[PDB]
Swiss-Prot record, chain A:
<protein>
    <recommendedName>
        <fullName>Insulin A chain</fullName>
    </recommendedName>
</protein>
<feature type="disulfide bond">
    <location>
        <begin position="6"/>
        <end position="11"/>
    </location>
</feature>
Length: 21, 30
């Protein structure tokens, strides 16, 4: 999930946008 | 601002800024 991708590893715009509606 | 470790309120703020009017979902447990 987002925590694994952005908090415990380095986040990216690509990944953040996966969580926009 | 997005290319770093982002946790908690810091992560939610990034989602808010990036997603704009699209909105977003934040699901930390999964």
């Amino acid at each position: 999930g987002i925590v694994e991708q952005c908090c415990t590893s380095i986040c990216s715009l690509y990944q953040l946008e996966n969580y926009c509606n | 601002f997005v290319n770093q470790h982002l946790c908690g309120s810091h992560l939610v703020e990034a989602l808010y800024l990036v997603c704009x009017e699209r909105x977003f979902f934040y699901t930390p447990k999964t």
